[PDB]
């Protein structure tokens, strides 16, 4: 619809027509921080606007409250906005308090033009239809979902808008039925924003190995939560790697050679920086398959390395110093054995980048470094704001880590990633050993009342690390029904729980249609009914924060609801 | 006794005998003892296998007699047999010890 993927060129041309000059800064980019894909999309977009020498501002934004604040203080000289990684699923024209007649200019013709554009680069669905059809100012970068899927909803929206007797009754009842069945769909990500910007760069003729690596990273960040989208996009990335790879063969490793291979990139955690043992031990999937949170699973991992013919001391060597013969033979040693433990999905090909003589890094490892930098990089309302400020500031450590000049910052990211995953793992074995997960009939509940490293989980991405670590474990069990999960954690400082509504998902190797997140609107319904004090301004609207005394009534009303 | 253990037909027979002992002696649960102990040995990356002598005295007791009267020869044979048993249980444990 609003700009299909065939016509992203026209939106970019409109940006350069309206909001580019040597004279002035005119372009603002709002990017949702705590989102790797939005970050990579913004980095690609900023390299584009640097090369075209467009004066622009990037603002990292935590959530909708800060969005409405920052929009409100924009000057009229700013005649284009880009909203990256948010905003598609809310009526922005209503939420930002837009009146189009305040922005309209130069009607002549059955036509209008406007003093400001608001381009939306968002992969979340379902779209709000006021954005996609109602607004003349909001301009969504569509992946094709609208044209593929929403013809009935298009017709219903326009006929209901037209329909200001028996026929009137039938029609209005019908199209309200359609729209109220389209809304109250569960939320879901269908694309990578970085791949949408990459398709724009293909349209303009701007692709290069740097922009391709950013696209690979932003796409790779979806792999944990949105495996189907990653599988959809992976062939196109292989095409582009081959198209942009140089023609030399027997290429001798040389301090100027940037290379970007497709090669075996196992589903282990930070393999090329951990030891081998640790890269198995702290992997979400390995923990899920082997049930590694208990001594029997630990015994199984030891059994595996013994059967592989790898001494445990060698397995615990840091990967660079780990035995070269094992490093050569590792693919064979895995092929011979991992089916024997059901770990066959560990085998994967992924994108590996190596620059000169300074090591090798997969997209998997690189996004782990970037996420760790976002998470742990650097009165109640003021304390909350000073925390959100830390996260807005962590954005620039992940941003600067994307630059090869600053690989020491990437190594900070690697170290923080290891220690974060360690904290997640210890919290996870605490949850499962003390059997914290209460099995309510409709959904599973886990609430962290106390424990070490509790002060990390007040960050949404760290909470989602733990949520994904739990969900892999539940998904790979045979006894459990696949049910949604609520994960909650008290902040003793603010006296508020941070609460996350998490989808289930199938086992990692199986293939069916996707599972949608309906906590996003269920939390809204309970919020709208209740007298409780709960914040719902996070862009990932399946996350909320709520006062301690209000949680148990909120959860009781939730489990009475039929919406999950 | 040592002159008997070192006779090569006797030595090869003793090797087969101890291998059969390790693979077939069980707990009253029917679980093989040295199957489980070898599984544990590899998990620990250990170089040592604890053979209970009373088990060897219960089955193939002549080997228990030779082990008592002539341990230096017998333990060389039994070490080769134990490595064979665990190499059977874990391929390429020769890489670990």
Swiss-Prot record, chain A:
Single GO molecular function: chromatin binding
Compartments reported by the entry: Nucleus
InterPro entries the UniProt entry points to: CDC45 (IPR003874)
First-listed, main subcellular location of the protein, grouped into a coarse class: nucleus
One GO CC term on file: nuclear replication fork
Swiss-Prot/TrEMBL keywords: Cell cycle, DNA replication, Nucleus, Phosphoprotein
Disulfide bond entries: none
Superkingdom per UniProt: Eukaryota
Family annotation (Pfam families): CDC45
Alphabetical GO biological process terms: DNA replication initiation; double-strand break repair via break-induced replication; mitotic DNA replication preinitiation complex assembly
Family per similarity comment: Belongs to the CDC45 family.
Subunit structure: Assembles into a complex with MCM5/CDC46. Interacts with MCM10.
Physiological role: Required for initiation of chromosomal DNA replication. Acts at the origin of replication. Also has a role in minichromosome maintenance.
Additional information: Present with 1730 molecules/cell in log phase SD medium.
Protein name: Cell division control protein 45
From Swiss-Prot, chain B:
Compartment(s) where it occurs, according to its Swiss-Prot or TrEMBL record: Nucleus
Domain of life: Eukaryota
Miscellaneous remark of the record: Present with 1690 molecules/cell in log phase SD medium. Early fractionation of eukaryotic MCM proteins yielded a variety of dimeric, trimeric and tetrameric complexes with unclear biological significance. Specifically a MCM467 subcomplex is shown to have in vitro helicase activity which is inhibited by the MCM2 subunit. The MCM2-7 hexamer is the proposed physiological active complex.
Family membership: Belongs to the MCM family.
Assembly mode: Component of the MCM2-7 complex. The complex forms a toroidal hexameric ring with the proposed subunit order MCM2-MCM6-MCM4-MCM7-MCM3-MCM5; loaded onto DNA, forms a head-head double hexamer.
Function noted in UniProt: Acts as a component of the MCM2-7 complex (MCM complex) which is the putative replicative helicase essential for 'once per cell cycle' DNA replication initiation and elongation in eukaryotic cells. The active ATPase sites in the MCM2-7 ring are formed through the interaction surfaces of two neighboring subunits such that a critical structure of a conserved arginine finger motif is provided in trans relative to the ATP-binding site of the Walker A box of the adjacent subunit.
Designated name of the protein: DNA replication licensing factor MCM2
Species the sequence originates in: Saccharomyces cerevisiae (strain ATCC 204508 / S288c)
Residues of the full protein shown: 194 to 290 of 868
């Amino acid at each position: 619809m609003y700009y299909g993927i065939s016509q992203f060129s026209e939106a970019y041309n409109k940006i350069l027509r309206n909001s580019s000059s040597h004279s002035s800064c005119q372009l603002v980019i709002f990017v949702s921080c705590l989102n790797i894909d939005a970050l990579c999309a913004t980095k690609m977009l900023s390299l584009l606007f640097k090369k075209q020498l467009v004066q622009s501002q990037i603002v990292p934004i935590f959530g909708y409250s800060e969005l409405r604040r920052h929009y409100s203080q924009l000057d009229d000289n700013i005649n284009s906005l880009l909203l990256v990684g948010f905003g598609g699923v809310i009526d922005l024209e209503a939420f930002l308090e837009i009146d189009p007649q305040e922005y309209v200019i130069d009607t002549d013709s059955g036509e209008q033009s406007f003093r400001r554009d608001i381009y939306v680069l968002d992969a979340h669905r379902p779209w709000n239809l006021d954005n996609i059809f109602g607004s003349q100012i909001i301009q969504c970068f569509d992946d094709g979902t609208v044209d593929d899927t929403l013809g009935e909803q298009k017709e219903a929206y326009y006929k209901l808008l037209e329909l200001d007797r028996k026929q009137r009754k039938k029609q209005i009842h019908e199209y309200e039925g359609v729209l109220e069945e389209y809304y109250s769909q569960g939320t879901t990500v269908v694309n990578s924003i970085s791949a949408q910007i990459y398709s724009l760069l293909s349209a303009i003729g701007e692709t290069n190995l740097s922009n391709l690596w950013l696209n690979i990273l932003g796409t790779t960040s979806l792999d944990i939560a949105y495996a189907q989208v990653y599988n959809r996009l992976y062939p196109l990335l292989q095409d582009e790697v081959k198209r942009l790879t140089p023609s030399s063969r027997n290429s001798v490793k040389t301090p100027d050679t940037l290379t970007l291979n497709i090669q075996p990139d196992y589903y282990l955690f930070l393999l090329r920086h951990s030891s081998l043992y640790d890269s198995f031990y702290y992997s979400n999937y390995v923990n899920a398959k082997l049930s590694l949170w208990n001594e029997n699973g630990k015994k199984r991992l030891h059994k595996m390395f013994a059967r592989m013919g790898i001494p445990l001391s060698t397995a615990q060597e840091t990967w660079l110093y780990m035995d070269h013969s094992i490093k050569r033979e590792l693919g064979i040693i895995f092929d011979k054995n991992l089916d024997r433990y059901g770990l066959q999905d560990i085998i994967r090909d992924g994108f590996v980048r190596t620059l000169g003589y300074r090591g090798s890094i997969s997209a998997s490892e690189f996004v782990e470094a970037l996420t760790a930098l976002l998470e742990v990089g650097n009165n109640s309302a003021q304390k909350l704001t000073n925390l959100r400020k830390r996260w807005v500031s962590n954005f620039w450590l992940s941003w600067d880590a994307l630059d090869d000049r600053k690989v020491e910052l990437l190594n900070r990211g690697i170290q923080l990633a290891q220690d974060l995953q360690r904290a997640i793992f210890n919290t996870g074995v605490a949850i499962l050993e003390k059997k914290l997960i209460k099995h309510l009939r409709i959904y599973r509940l886990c609430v962290l009342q106390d424990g070490p490293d509790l002060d990390l989980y007040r960050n949404p991405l760290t909470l989602l690390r733990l949520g994904n670590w739990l969900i892999e474990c539940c998904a790979e069990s045979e006894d459990k029904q696949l049910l949604p999960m609520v994960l909650a954690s008290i902040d003793e400082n603010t006296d508020t729980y941070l609460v996350a509504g998490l989808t289930p998902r199938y086992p990692r190797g199986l293939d069916k249609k996707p599972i949608l997140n309906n906590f996003s609107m269920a939390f809204q319904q309970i919020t709208a009914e209740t007298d409780a004090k709960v914040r719902i301004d996070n862009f990932e609207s399946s996350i909320i924060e709520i006062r301690r005394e209000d949680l148990s009534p909120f959860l009781e009303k939730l489990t009475l609801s039929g919406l999950l | 006794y040592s002159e008997w253990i070192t006779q090569p037909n006797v030595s090869r027979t003793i090797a087969r005998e101890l291998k059969s002992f390790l693979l077939e002696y069980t707990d009253e649960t029917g679980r093989s003892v040295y199957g489980a102990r070898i599984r544990t040995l590899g998990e620990m990356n250990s170089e040592s296998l604890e053979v209970n002598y009373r088990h060897l005295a219960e089955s193939k007791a002549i080997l228990a007699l030779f082990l008592a009267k002539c341990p230096e020869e017998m333990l060389k044979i039994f070490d080769l047999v134990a490595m064979e048993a665990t190499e059977l249980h874990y391929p390429d444990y020769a890489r670990i010890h």
